[PDB]
């Protein structure tokens, strides 16, 4: 029983909505769902219903993790972004419909609320619907990002049709998105994956040469997973497991830094020595990241081996506190050798 609740959100609208939901009696998950739909309206550069993400939770003294990361469409292939010479096609994995994974956000927010929410699903969409119907004020960084996006996209997508009118300080309204969110409030995720919204998404794929099909949408599932647990100095950090690399990375970053405590003593934050030491640890983290990590149901990822204390101590020994290690000689840590 704390002094209250709290939110830290990436814009003023997400923060206001979270605060209202908490004040109205919703729990942190209710507030999170409402915030996530709000930012899908007010923060379109990143907040979304057409992308995916991860949620780490602590509820009644227990940790949880919800994976609503996008999945490759069923028609995706290993070499889909390479041309007939085997070279990467410029921006094919970044611009246009073939760059899209199957969206997870609507299913993820649904699952979180189904499991832990106290308020009605439709209540949690009303704020976002409101910002879509009546608008929000465009931010400075948004206008700058949009200016860059018009250049990269135009004239390759329909981005300008919908976001060309964004102008800083001006109220931006999104009537079609408001109707989409009303359908999600009424029908649940079935609208997005089976219903009117699904059909519109499929139509867009067919028009743009995309790969996502009705089968892809109907087969999408968010996945509850056990969070990564990291213990140090009497604390317990819960963070993202695979298919995030960040949990393993943080296990190795924190573990190695603690092993090298003697090299950090007396070094000031963001001195050259401090930055050099962090870079030396990061060299090893990214060597393992590139070699071992990916979707845990598609390979046998050696998670325990990469996070075992004896392994962390070995990798910690490689850090060179006095000079840059030969990049060419930094190896994946589980690699057999002579």
């Amino acid at each position: 029983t704390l002094d209250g609740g709290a939110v830290a959100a990436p814009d003023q609208y997400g923060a206001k909505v979270a605060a209202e939901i908490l004040k109205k009696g919703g729990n942190a998950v209710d507030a999170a769902v409402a915030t996530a739909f709000t930012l899908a309206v007010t923060y379109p550069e990143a907040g979304n219903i057409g992308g995916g993400g991860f949620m780490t939770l602590y509820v009644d003294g227990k940790p949880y993790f919800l994976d609503y990361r996008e999945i490759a469409p069923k028609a995706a292939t290993k070499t889909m972004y390479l041309n007939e010479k085997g070279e990467v096609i410029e921006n094919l994995s970044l611009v246009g419909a073939k760059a899209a994974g199957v969206p997870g956000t609507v299913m993820g927010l649904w699952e979180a609320h189904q499991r832990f929410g106290k308020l009605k699903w439709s209540e949690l969409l009303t704020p976002a619907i409101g910002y879509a119907q009546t608008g929000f004020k465009v931010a400075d960084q948004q206008y700058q990002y949009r200016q860059d996006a018009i250049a990269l996209f135009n004239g390759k997508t329909n981005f300008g049709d919908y976001f060309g009118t964004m102008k800083p300080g001006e109220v931006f309204k999104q009537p079609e998105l408001a109707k989409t969110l009303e359908r999600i409030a009424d029908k649940g995720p079935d609208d997005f994956y089976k219903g009117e919204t699904a059909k519109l998404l499929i139509a867009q794929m067919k028009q743009d040469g995309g790969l996502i099909t009705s089968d892809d949408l109907v087969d999408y599932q968010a996945k509850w997973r056990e969070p990564m647990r990291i213990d140090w100095q009497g604390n317990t950090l819960y963070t993202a497991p695979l298919p995030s690399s960040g949990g393993i990375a943080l296990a190795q970053l924190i573990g190695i830094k603690e092993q090298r405590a003697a090299d950090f003593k007396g070094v000031e934050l963001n001195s050259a020595k401090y930055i050099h030491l962090l870079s030396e640890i990061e060299k090893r983290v990214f060597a393992d990241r590139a070699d071992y990590l990916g979707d845990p149901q598609f390979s046998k990822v050696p998670v325990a081996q990469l996070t075992d204390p004896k392994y962390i101590a070995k990798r910690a020994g490689e850090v060179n506190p006095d000079a840059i290690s030969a990049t060419e000689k930094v190896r994946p840590g589980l690699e057999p050798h002579q």
Binding site: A6, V7, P44, G53, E70, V95, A139, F159, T239, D291
Partner: protein, 194 residues
Amino acid sequence: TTHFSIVDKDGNAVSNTYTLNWDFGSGVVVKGAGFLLNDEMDDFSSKPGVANAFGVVGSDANAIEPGKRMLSSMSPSIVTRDGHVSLVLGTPGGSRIFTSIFQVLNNVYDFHLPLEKAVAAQRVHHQLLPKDTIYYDAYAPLTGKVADELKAMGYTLEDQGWNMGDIQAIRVNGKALETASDPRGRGVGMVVKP
């Protein structure tokens, strides 16, 4: 990408990072529905050893396969101590996400900075490839003595051209709460009485 952090009056917490990947994703809007589609597929390895838009590489484990989740760097985090939420944090930033969280954690737990200073502090990033390249942002560029020292060591310093994350954090101190929103972004934090 973007991140938000929430704690309720019962001590429950949510840390949520979600994304289209790059700004506005693929640029494709679903006609009649009005939302953008992600360009998350670039987080797969398209070709062994060839870097993606964040400079990271892969081979078999993160190759494209039907139905597969592409490797992420998103790291929504909750610290607890003695069974109680103590810190909630996360950030966008692609391959910089978990190095940025690491730095903030160091700043809070090792340098014992106030949360606002821990989040506002200069952050930098290195990731093996590109070789010996340390990235900085224009919010807190590497400069002066430290930059000369690093260059003298043989590091290449580069302005990556976008801010190094956007941390949104909540700290719990007994019954009291405080928020911090990264000065690199336009975030807002609020404590709400029960």
